[PDB]
Amino acid sequence: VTTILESPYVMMKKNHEMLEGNERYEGYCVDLAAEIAKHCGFKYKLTIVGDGKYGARDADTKIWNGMVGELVYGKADIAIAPLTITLVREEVIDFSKPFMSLGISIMIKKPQKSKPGVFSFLDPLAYEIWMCIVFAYIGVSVVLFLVSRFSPYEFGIFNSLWFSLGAFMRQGCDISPRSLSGRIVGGVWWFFTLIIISSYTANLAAFLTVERMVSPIESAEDLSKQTEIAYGTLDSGSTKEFFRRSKIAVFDKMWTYMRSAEPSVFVRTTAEGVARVRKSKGKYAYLLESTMNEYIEQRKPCDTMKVGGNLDSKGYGIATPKGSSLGTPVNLAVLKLSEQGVLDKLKNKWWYDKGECGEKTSALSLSNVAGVFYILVGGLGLAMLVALIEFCYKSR
Amino acid sequence: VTTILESPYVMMKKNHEMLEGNERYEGYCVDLAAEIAKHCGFKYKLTIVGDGKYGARDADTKIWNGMVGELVYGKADIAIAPLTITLVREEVIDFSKPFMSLGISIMIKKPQKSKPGVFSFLDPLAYEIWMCIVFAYIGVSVVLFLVSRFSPYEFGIFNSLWFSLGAFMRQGCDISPRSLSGRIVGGVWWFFTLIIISSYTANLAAFLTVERMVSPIESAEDLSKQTEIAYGTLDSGSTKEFFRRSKIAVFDKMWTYMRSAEPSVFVRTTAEGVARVRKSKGKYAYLLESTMNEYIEQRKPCDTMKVGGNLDSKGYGIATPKGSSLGTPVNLAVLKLSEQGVLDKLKNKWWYDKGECGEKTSALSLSNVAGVFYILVGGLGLAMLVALIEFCYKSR
Amino acid sequence: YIVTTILEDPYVMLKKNANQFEGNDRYEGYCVELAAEIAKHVGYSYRLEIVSDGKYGARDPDTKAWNGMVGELVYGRADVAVAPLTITLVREEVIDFSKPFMSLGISIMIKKPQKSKPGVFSFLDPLAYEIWMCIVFAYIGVSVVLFLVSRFSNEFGIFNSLWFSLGAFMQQGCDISPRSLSGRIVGGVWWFFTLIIISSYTANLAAFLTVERMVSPIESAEDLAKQTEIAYGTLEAGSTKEFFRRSKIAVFEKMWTYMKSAEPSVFVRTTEEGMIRVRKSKGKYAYLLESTMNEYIEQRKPCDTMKVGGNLDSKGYGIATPKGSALRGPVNLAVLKLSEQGVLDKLKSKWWYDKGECGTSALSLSNVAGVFYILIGGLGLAMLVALIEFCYKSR
Amino acid sequence: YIVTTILEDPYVMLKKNANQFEGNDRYEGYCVELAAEIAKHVGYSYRLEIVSDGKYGARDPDTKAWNGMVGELVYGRADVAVAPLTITLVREEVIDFSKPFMSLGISIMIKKPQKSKPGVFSFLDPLAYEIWMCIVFAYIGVSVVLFLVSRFSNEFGIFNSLWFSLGAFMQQGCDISPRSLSGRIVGGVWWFFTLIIISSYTANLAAFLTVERMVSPIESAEDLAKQTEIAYGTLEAGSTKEFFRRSKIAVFEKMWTYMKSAEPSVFVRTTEEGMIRVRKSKGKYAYLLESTMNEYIEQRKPCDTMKVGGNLDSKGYGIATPKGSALRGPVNLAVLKLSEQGVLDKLKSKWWYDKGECGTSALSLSNVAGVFYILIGGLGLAMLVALIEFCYKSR
Amino acid sequence: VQVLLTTIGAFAAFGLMTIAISTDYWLYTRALICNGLTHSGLWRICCLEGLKRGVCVKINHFAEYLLRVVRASSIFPILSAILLLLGGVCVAASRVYKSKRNIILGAGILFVAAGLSNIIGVIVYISANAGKNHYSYGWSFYFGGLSFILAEVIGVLAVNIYIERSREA
Amino acid sequence: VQVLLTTIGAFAAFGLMTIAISTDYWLYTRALICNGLTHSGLWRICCLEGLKRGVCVKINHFAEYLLRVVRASSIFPILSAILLLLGGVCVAASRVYKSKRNIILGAGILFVAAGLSNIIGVIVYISANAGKNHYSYGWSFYFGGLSFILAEVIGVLAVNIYIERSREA
Ligand SMILES: NS(=O)(=O)c1cccc2c1c([N+](=O)[O-])cc1[nH]c(=O)c(=O)[nH]c12
Ligand SMILES: NS(=O)(=O)c1cccc2c1c([N+](=O)[O-])cc1[nH]c(=O)c(=O)[nH]c12
Ligand SMILES: NS(=O)(=O)c1cccc2c1c([N+](=O)[O-])cc1[nH]c(=O)c(=O)[nH]c12
Numbered sequence A, B: 001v002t003t004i005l006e007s008p009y010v011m012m013k014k015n016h017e018m019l020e021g022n023e024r025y026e027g028y029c030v031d032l033a034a035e036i037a038k039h040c041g042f043k044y045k046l047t048i049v050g051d052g053k054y055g056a057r058d059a060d061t062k063i064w065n066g067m068v069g070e071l072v073y074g075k076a077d078i079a080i081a082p083l084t085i086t087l088v089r090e091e092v093i094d095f096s097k098p099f100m101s102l103g104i105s106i107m108i109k110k111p112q113k114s115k116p117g118v119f120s121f122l123d124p125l126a127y128e129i130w131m132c133i134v135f136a137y138i139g140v141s142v143v144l145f146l147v148s149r150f151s152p153y154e155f156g157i158f159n160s161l162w163f164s165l166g167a168f169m170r171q172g173c174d175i176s177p178r179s180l181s182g183r184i185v186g187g188v189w190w191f192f193t194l195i196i197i198s199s200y201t202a203n204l205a206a207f208l209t210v211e212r213m214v215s216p217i218e219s220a221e222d223l224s225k226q227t228e229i230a231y232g233t234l235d236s237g238s239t240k241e242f243f244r245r246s247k248i249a250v251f252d253k254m255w256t257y258m259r260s261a262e263p264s265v266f267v268r269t270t271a272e273g274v275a276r277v278r279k280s281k282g283k284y285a286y287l288l289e290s291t292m293n294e295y296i297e298q299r300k301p302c303d304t305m306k307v308g309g310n311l312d313s314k315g316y317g318i319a320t321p322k323g324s325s326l327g328t329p330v331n332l333a334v335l336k337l338s339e340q341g342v343l344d345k346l347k348n349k350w351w352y353d354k355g356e357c358g359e360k361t362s363a364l365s366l367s368n369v370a371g372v373f374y375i376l377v378g379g380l381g382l383a384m385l386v387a388l389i390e391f392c393y394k395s396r
Numbered sequence C, D: 001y002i003v004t005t006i007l008e009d010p011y012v013m014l015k016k017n018a019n020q021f022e023g024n025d026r027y028e029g030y031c032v033e034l035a036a037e038i039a040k041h042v043g044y045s046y047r048l049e050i051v052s053d054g055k056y057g058a059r060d061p062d063t064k065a066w067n068g069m070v071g072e073l074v075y076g077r078a079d080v081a082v083a084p085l086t087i088t089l090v091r092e093e094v095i096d097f098s099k100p101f102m103s104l105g106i107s108i109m110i111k112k113p114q115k116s117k118p119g120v121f122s123f124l125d126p127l128a129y130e131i132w133m134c135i136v137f138a139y140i141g142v143s144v145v146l147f148l149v150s151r152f153s154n155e156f157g158i159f160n161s162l163w164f165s166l167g168a169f170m171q172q173g174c175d176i177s178p179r180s181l182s183g184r185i186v187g188g189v190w191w192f193f194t195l196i197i198i199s200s201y202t203a204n205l206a207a208f209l210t211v212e213r214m215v216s217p218i219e220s221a222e223d224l225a226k227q228t229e230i231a232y233g234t235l236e237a238g239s240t241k242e243f244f245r246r247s248k249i250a251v252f253e254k255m256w257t258y259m260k261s262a263e264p265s266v267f268v269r270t271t272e273e274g275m276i277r278v279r280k281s282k283g284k285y286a287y288l289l290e291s292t293m294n295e296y297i298e299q300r301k302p303c304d305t306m307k308v309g310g311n312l313d314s315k316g317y318g319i320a321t322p323k324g325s326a327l328r329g330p331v332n333l334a335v336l337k338l339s340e341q342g343v344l345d346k347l348k349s350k351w352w353y354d355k356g357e358c359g360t361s362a363l364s365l366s367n368v369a370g371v372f373y374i375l376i377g378g379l380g381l382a383m384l385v386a387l388i389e390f391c392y393k394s395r
Numbered sequence E, F: 001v002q003v004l005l006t007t008i009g010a011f012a013a014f015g016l017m018t019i020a021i022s023t024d025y026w027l028y029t030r031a032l033i034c035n036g037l038t039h040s041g042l043w044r045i046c047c048l049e050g051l052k053r054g055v056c057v058k059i060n061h062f063a064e065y066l067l068r069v070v071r072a073s074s075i076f077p078i079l080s081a082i083l084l085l086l087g088g089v090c091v092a093a094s095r096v097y098k099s100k101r102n103i104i105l106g107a108g109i110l111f112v113a114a115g116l117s118n119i120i121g122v123i124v125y126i127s128a129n130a131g132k133n134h135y136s137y138g139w140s141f142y143f144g145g146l147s148f149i150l151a152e153v154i155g156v157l158a159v160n161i162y163i164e165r166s167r168e169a
C-alpha cells in the first residue's frame, strides 16, 4: 500500500516517533484503506512515496514517479491517495470508480466589517430616494412660491425655500401659509417629511440590529466581470492547463485576464496562495480543488471561505497496476462502501468533526458619522465665506 | 408477560385486527420487553390485564387485581408496565431497579398572545418612570414660574405649565424664556424629553420585534401564592394522598387550598383534567406524573406545557412474584440496559421522535392603541365641560 | 453497433417533426451528441435503439432475471448503453461501466420566490386601516371641538383650527397656540395622541424591516432539518428513499424520522407530480431529486423553481457495456478524453442553459412611491385651488 | 452493627467541635440522619465507622480485588453502607442495593449572572464619548459662527445664538429664525446634523434593547451543543466521562466529539477545581456534574453558581448490603416507607436548603436615572443663578 | 338662511345613523357558526350564501367584561342618534320662540357630543369585534361615518349661526 | 479694556495649541509594536513601562488614502495654530495704526477659522486613530480642546469689540 502525505489524507499521528506500526499515521485515506481491507481481507503495511509527488510522466525519462511509479514497477500493490483520475494514468493502470468527486472552486477571505466609510449615514436610503427628496423639496418650494405670489391672499422664493427646508427637518417655521393652497402644500410636505424620516430611522435600526456580511462574488462569472479582485491559480499546474485548454468563452475571458497579469497573478505553492489571499485583504481570490478549499475553510484561523460552485469535475480513485488480480474486488469494495454511507461519514469526521471552527452590539463611533461633521464644518466655512462676500459687495 | 394498556407503553399497532401475533402492539414497554428478553433469552407472549388497573389491594377481598394480581396468582411470569414502585407491592413481589424515574409535575396551557389591554401603550416604560415624569414636569414648571416671577428680566404658572407640556411633546412653544435661568431650565427639560421619548420608541420597537411569552409560574411555590389559578389533582388518586400525607408546609398550604375548593378543584379522569386545562383558558393547572405531562406536551394540538420541577420522586420497575427464578436476571438486565444508553433512546424515540410537534410580524391594531383614543375623547369631553362651566360662571 | 437508450429529457428525446427524419437522425439530445462524439473517437458505427420496457434496470425479486435497459444489455441484445445510468453495486456486478461522464447527487428544489413588488401604499402597513380611519375621525373631532370651545363666549377659526391640529399631528410646529384653558387641554391631549401614534408607527416599521432582514432562506439540508412550516418529500420509491432508509448520517436520519411521520403524504408517485405539487404549494413545499433534473427544470419555463444548497450524496451517470465486452478500453478512454478537453461541459451547458427557456437592503423608492404620488397629487390640487382662488378674486 | 460511610458533604461530615463528642454523635449529615431513621425503623444498633481508603469502590484491574467502600463491604468487614453509592451493574453483581432513596443525574452548573446594575449614565452608551464631545464642540462652533455672521455688517446674540442652536439640536422649536442667507445656511446645516444624530441615537438604542432581549441563556444541554464562546468540561475520569464515551445519543455524541478536541484542557482533576474554574471563568465556563452536588453548591455561599436545564441521565444513590445478607428486606422496606411518608424530602430540604448559606422587560428607572440627576442639578443651578441675578439686580 | 341647511343636515344625519343602527349590514366576514360568508350586523349576525340563508338571529356576546357589556348594549351609537334627535329638536325650538340666544348653542353642543359618541361607539365596536380570515365593512359602517361627519359639520354651522346672531348685540 | 483680555486669550490659546501639537501626550494605549502601555502622540508614538522605555520614534502612517495623508500631515491643527498666530498679530496691528475698523474683524474671522480647523483636526485624528483594547486621552488633547474654546471666545469678543467700536460712527 503506497500512499502520499497530503492533509487530511495521510499525516503523522500524535507522537510520530513514539507511535510505531500502522498507528503512526492518521487521516481519511488510512480509514479508507482499513475499510477496503475489511472487504478485500488483505494484508498491508502503510507506506509513502519516495519522490514526493503523486505521479506524472517524466519529461524525457518517461519513468513513472510517485504512487504511480511505485505501483507500475511492483514496489507497491495498491494505492490510496488523492489521485486525480485522468486519461494518461488510465492508460497505464486501472483505477476504480471515484470515491470522492470534486472540481475547481473559488477561495476568498471571509468578508469582515469594513470600516464605515464617510457618508455611511446615507446607507439606509437609496440614492434614488435622496435625489427624489431633493427634487421634491425644490418642486414644493417653487409651487408654494408661485401660489403665494399669484394669490397673495410674505412667501418669497427665499422664504419659501427656508420654510420647506425647516419643514423637512422637523424644526419650527417662523411663517406659515395663510392661503388655502399654501396650507395644502404645507400639510402635504409635512406628511412626506414625517414618513421619510420615520422610514430612515427604522431602516437604520434594522441595519444596526442585524449584521449581514455579503460576499461580493457569487460564482465564477461574478468575478469574471469584477475586474477589481485579482484571481490566479498556481503558476504551473492542472488548473492553469484547464483554463488554457478551455473552449468555453466565460473561462476564456478569465484565462485572457490571467495572461495579461501585472504583477503575475500566480503562485508557486498552495500555502503561498493561502497566505496571499489571507494577507491580500480581500483583493485576491484563489482557484483550487474544492476538497482543499473545504479543508482550509475548517482550519484556523478560519479567515477564508469557499464561494460559488464547482467549475470542472474530477474524481479521486484507487489505483492498481494493469492485470492485478485485485482491481475488481477493490472497485466493488469502493463502490459498496460509497453507497453504504461511509465515505460521507469519513469526510464528515475528518473535514468537519476535526474542524478548527464550526453578539452584544456596539455603540456608534465617529467613523460611522464623521461625514455629517465634515458637511457641518463645510457649511460653516461656506456661510462665513458667503457672508464675507456679501459684505464686501454691499460695502462698495 | 402481563402488561397494561396506557399510552405510550402498550398500544394497538396499525391494523389492530389485520396484524396478529406480537406485532399487534407497539410502544415503549414492547421494546423494553424485547430488550429484556434479548438478555434473559426467554419465550414470552404479549398479554394484557383483565380488570383494567395496574394493581391494588382490594378494599375487603384483599385479592390482588391487575398486573400484580396476575403475577401473584401464576397467571403471568413477569410484568412490564408503568408500575409505581411502592411499599405495599414491594411486600408481595420483588421489583427491579427503576427503569424510569419521575415525579409529580405541573401542567398548564401553553401561554399565548393575550389580547392587548387598554393602556398597553405604557408597557415600554415602567410606572415608576411615568410617575417620575409627571413629578418632574410639575417641578420644572414650578421652578420656571418661581424664577420668572422673582427675576422677571410673561411666564405665569399657567403659561409655565403650558410651555413645559408643549416641550415634553416636541411641539412649538409660543413663548421662550429670555432669562438665563429660564433658559437653563428649558434646555434641561428639552434634554430630558428627547432622551425619554427616544427611549420609549426604542423599547417599543424591541417589544414589537421579538415576542417573549413568559409563563406566570415557575415552580410549585410560584402558584402556591398565586391564589388566582385553580390547581387540583384527581379527586381520588395517589397525588391526592401525597398532598394529604405531606409534612412539608409549602405543600400543606396547597393541600389546604385544595381542601377549601369552590367548586371542587378536582377531576375524575386524566382526560378530564387535560380537557379542563385546555378549556380553562389559563385558569387551571393540573398536577400529574411528569411522564404523562411530557407525553401530552408532545401530542397535538400541543396546547399545553410542563412547568417547574418534580415535587416528589418515584420509579417504574419490572415486577416479579416472590421466589421467581427470574428476578435477579431481569434486575441485572434492566440495570445494564439503563446504563448502556438504551432506555434514554427508547424514551426519545417514543415521547419525542413520535411527537406531534417539535414570523412576519403584524401591523398594529386598535386593540393595541385604543387607550389613547379613549383618553383623547375623555379630554375632549372634559374640555367642553370646563369651557361650558367657565362660560356659565363668567356669564353670571 | 446497437445502442440502447431511454427517453428521459433533456437526454435523448423525440426530435420535433420526427416524420421528416428517421434512424439516428430521428432523435436529438445530450446522450445523442455524446454517443456521436464517442463514435467519432472510438471509430465504430451505431444505430440508436430505444428500450422497450422503459425501465433502467432492476433485479426481479420473484425471478433473478433483470428487467429493463440493463436487461437489454446483459442478455446480449445490446452492445452499449448511453443514458443516465446511475452506477451501483448490483449493476456493477453484472454490467460494467466506464468512468462517470457526469456527476450528480441529491439536491433540493424550492419554489422560486417571485420578486414581491411592494404595494404602492406599503408605507401604511405598519398601522392598520382602522387606525388611520379613526385618526382622521379624531383629527376632525379635535379640530371642531377646539374651534367651538375657543370661539364662542379669538384668532382661531375652523380653517385655523384644522390647520393647528394638522400641524400638531405632524410635529411641525404651531403658528398659533390656544390661550384658553380648555383650548390648552384639548391641544395637550392631541399632542399626547400624536406623539404616541407616531412613536408606535416608527417602532412597528422598524420591527417590520428588522424581521424582514433576519430571514435566512433554505440554503442547506440542515436548514430543512429545522423547518416545520415547509414540508418536503421524494419519489414514492427510488434510490432516494433507499438512501434515507440506510442513512448512517445524523441530519438525514432526522429527516427520515420526519418523513416516517409522512402524514399528510409527502411522497409522490411521479416526478412531474412533485414538480406540480411544489409549483402549486406556494413556497410551502420542497422536493428532493437528482441535481441534474433540478437544474434542468430551473431552466425550463415556467421559471417557478430553483436549486438550493449543494449535493447531499454523490453518484455518477456512466456508460455501460456487457460484462467482458471488447469496448471497455476505447469507451472509457474516450470518455476521459472528452472530459479532459472540456467537451462534456460544453454539451451540458448547451442542453441545460443554451437551449433553455429562461435565464442590497437599503430602502428603495418602490417602498415609498406612495407618498411621492400623494405629494404630486397634493401639489396639483394646490395649483388648481390657487387658480380657482385667483378666478374668484376677480369677484 | 458496623456502618460504613464516607465524608462527602453535605452527607456525613465532621461535626463542628468534634472533640466535645465521640462515636455516632461525633458526626452529623444527611446520611447520618437517614441511618438514624433506618435504625429506628428496622430496630437494630449501629456504630458509625468511616472508610479508610476514601474511595467508593472499583475493581482493581491488575487484581480482581475490590478497592474502597464496597471493598469494605464485600469482604465481610462491614454490615451495611449508607452513602452516595451510585448503583451500577458491576457493584450490583457483588453487592446488593435497596431501592434508590434519592435519584439524580448529570446536570449543568453555570456561573450565576450578577444583576448587572446599569450605569447611572447608561443612556449615553448608544453613542460614543467622542461623538458627544464633538457634538459639544460643533454646537459651540455653530453658535459662534451664527452670531458672528448674523451680527456684524439683528435680534440675534451670542446668548441668543447659543439658545437657538441648543433648541435646534433638541428639535424643540425656535422663537427667532435667521433672516440672512448665511444665517439660513448655517441653520439648515445644523438642522441636518441634529436630525441625523438623533435618528442614529434612537436607532442604536433600539438595537441595544432588541439584542439584549433576544438572548436565550443556557437552559438545556442542546443549547450547550450549539455554543462556542462557552466551554464546558467534566472530571478527569469518572462516570461522566464514561457516560459520554459510551453514549449512543446524538446530542451527547456531539458534545463528546467537542470534548475530544479538549484543547485547551477542559477536564478537571478535582470537583473543587472545576467549581473554582467556573467561579473564575466569568461566565465563559460551565461544568457538568451530579445534580445533587450542583444544587448543594448553588446554596453554599458564595452564591456564584446555579443549575440549569434538567438531568441528562438517571441514576440513584442506594443503600448497599453484603450479598446474601439478612437485612435486604427490612432496609428496602424502611427506605420505601420513609420515601412514601415524605421524610427523605424533608431531610433533603433541611440539609440542602434549610441549612443553606443563601437563598419584566419594560425599561426601568435605573436605566435612565442619569437624566433625572442631570435635571435636578440643572434645576438647582437655575435656582442659584436666579438668586445671583436677583442680588445683582439690586446693583 | 343657513338654518335650513342646518336642519336638513341634522335630519339627514339622524336618518343615516338610525338606518345604520337598524341595518344588520356592518361587517362582511366568513364565519363557522353558520356552517360561510355572512353580512354580520350590529344586533343580529345574519347568514348569506349558505343552507340557512336568511334564517338569522341575534348574536351572543359571551376589564374586558365591560367592553363586552358596552358592545352588547350599543349605548354610544344610540346616544349619538338620541343627541342628534335632541339637537334637531332644539334647532326647531330655536326657529320658533327666538330671541333666546342660548338654544342653538346647546344644539351645537349636542351635535358635537353626538359626533364623539359615534366615534366612541365605532372604536368600541371595532375593538370588541377583533379577537387569516379576511373581512370587510358594510355600508352601515360608512353610514355611521357619514352621520358623524354631518354631525360635526352641523355643530360647526350651528355654532357659527349662534355667534353671528349674538354678534348683533 | 477688553483688548487686553482678547490679546492675553489669543496668546494663551496659541501657546496651548502649540504645546499640544509639540507634546507627544495625546493617547494612552496598550500597543504591541513596543513589546505594553504607551503615551502615543500626534507625531511620535513613545513607549512607557517597557524595556524600550523612553527610546521612541516617529510613527508609520501606512478615499481612506486621503484620510491617512491628512492625518500624517497634521495640517489642520497646524492651520489652527497659524490662524491663531496671524489673528493675534492682526489684533496687535489693530492696537496700533487704529481707526481702520476692518482689522479686528479679520482677527475674529481668523479666530473662528482656527476653531473650525481645530475641530476638523480633532475629528480627523480620532477617525484615523480608530481601526477590546482600552485607552484614554492625554492632556495634549484637552489642551487642544481648551485652545478651541479660547479661540471661539476670542472670536466672539473680538467681533463684539469691532461692533462696539464701529457703533461710534
Ligand atoms: N493539495 S491540492 O492543493 O488539492 C493539489 C494541488 C495540485 C495538484 C494536486 C493536489 C491534490 N490534493 O488534493 O492534494 C491532489 C493531487 N493528486 C494528483 O494525482 C495530482 O496529479 N495532483 C494533485
Ligand atoms: N397515566 S397517568 O395519568 O400517568 C397515571 C395516573 C394515575 C395513576 C397511575 C398513572 C400511571 N401512568 O403513568 O400511566 C401509572 C400508574 N401505575 C401504577 O402502578 C399505579 O398505581 N397508578 C398509576
Ligand atoms: N427522472 S428523475 O426523476 O431524475 C429520476 C428519478 C428516479 C430514478 C431515476 C431518475 C433518473 N433521471 O434523471 O431521470 C434517471 C435514473 N437513471 C437510472 O439509471 C436509475 O436507476 N434511476 C433514475
Ligand SMILES: NS(=O)(=O)c1cccc2c1c([N+](=O)[O-])cc1[nH]c(=O)c(=O)[nH]c12
Binding pocket: D008, D056, D057, D084, D085, D086, D235, D238, D239, D271, D289, D290, D293
Ligand atoms: N463529589 S462529586 O463531585 O459529586 C462526585 C464525582 C464523581 C464521582 C462521585 C461523586 C460523588 N458525590 O456526589 O460526591 C459521589 C459518588 N458516589 C459513588 O458511589 C461513585 O461511584 N462516584 C461518586
